Design an enzyme around this catalytic site. Sequence first.
Site, PDB file in Angstrom:
ATOM      1  N   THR A  81       6.106  19.627  -9.466  1.00 41.55           N
ATOM      2  CA  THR A  81       6.369  20.942  -9.471  1.00 41.55           C
ATOM      3  C   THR A  81       7.389  21.326  -8.499  1.00 41.55           C
ATOM      4  O   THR A  81       7.969  20.350  -7.547  1.00 41.55           O
ATOM      5  CB  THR A  81       4.971  21.811  -8.513  1.00 41.55           C
ATOM      6  N   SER A  82       8.237  22.549  -8.998  1.00 44.31           N
ATOM      7  CA  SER A  82       9.042  23.068  -8.227  1.00 44.31           C
ATOM      8  C   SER A  82       8.932  23.038  -6.674  1.00 44.31           C
ATOM      9  O   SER A  82       7.926  23.876  -6.536  1.00 44.31           O
ATOM     10  CB  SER A  82       9.807  24.196  -8.794  1.00 44.31           C
TER      11      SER A  82
ATOM     12  N   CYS B 120       5.090  15.027   1.924  1.00 43.10           N
ATOM     13  CA  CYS B 120       3.654  14.487   2.051  1.00 43.10           C
ATOM     14  C   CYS B 120       3.597  12.928   2.461  1.00 43.10           C
ATOM     15  O   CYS B 120       4.549  12.420   2.063  1.00 43.10           O
ATOM     16  CB  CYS B 120       2.727  14.906   1.133  1.00 43.10           C
TER      17      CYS B 120
ATOM     18  N   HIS C 280       8.888  15.834  -2.429  1.00 45.97           N
ATOM     19  CA  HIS C 280       7.498  15.272  -2.759  1.00 45.97           C
ATOM     20  C   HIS C 280       7.660  13.828  -2.132  1.00 45.97           C
ATOM     21  O   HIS C 280       8.439  13.390  -2.005  1.00 45.97           O
ATOM     22  CB  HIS C 280       7.096  15.381  -3.976  1.00 45.97           C
ATOM     23  N   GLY C 281       6.433  13.622  -1.684  1.00 50.06           N
ATOM     24  CA  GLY C 281       6.404  12.321  -1.237  1.00 50.06           C
ATOM     25  C   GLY C 281       5.061  11.605  -0.966  1.00 50.06           C
ATOM     26  O   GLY C 281       4.003  12.388  -1.398  1.00 50.06           O
TER      27      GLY C 281
END
Lengths: 5, 240
Positions: B34-35, B135, B93-94
């Site tokens: 997601t954006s 994350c 993101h991660g």
Amino acid sequence: XDXXX
Amino acid sequence: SGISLDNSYKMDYPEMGLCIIINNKNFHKSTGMTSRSGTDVDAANLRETFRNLKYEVRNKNDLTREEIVELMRDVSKEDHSKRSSFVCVLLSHGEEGIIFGTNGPVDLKKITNFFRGDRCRSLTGKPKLFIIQACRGTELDCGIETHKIPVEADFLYAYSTAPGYYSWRNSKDGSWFIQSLCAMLKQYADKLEFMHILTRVNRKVATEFESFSFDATFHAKKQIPCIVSMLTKELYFYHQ
């Protein structure tokens, strides 16, 4: 708004 | 001359150093990620914050995993001899140990290895700061009512969240951690040593933020950032 990564 | 002490990094080189900001907002449709609404607010906040600390800021947007690696390799091959320090901020993101390019993951160790003491010699002995908003897993914090040096030395990892946990981001104000980091640097960079700045960021995140969600699974959650220091000296952004 929240939301997460 | 008189008695000399060597307890803080030399931060009076001609340049403070680079601040590379990798701002991944939009991911390949292919990946289904997601954006990251709010991340442009973080990237702008960081650019301004680090500009006022006299870093040469370079903002990069929506990089693939190959572009992230190429960028970091190229930056590590520059001559940093006249620079006091190096900063890299990763917004994506991660998962634990991983940051996402727009088309898939990159191990954080692959990025940081380019700057090892033995591999980027013009940064040996200088602080190398990696600030990571991503994350580190899927745990939720429900809170409670109130003549050689090591090649891994001189790195600091300022993680947005504890190992194993999600990291939260607000679409209007940005991520909780980057909002708080920028606020504390603006207030205290000319006053406090960096670990003490980051401890105030820990307190701000821990105390001032709590999630709000229509999905009970994700509602009323808390976050604590995680300072990981392999530094060998105190770091002040100012000098006399």
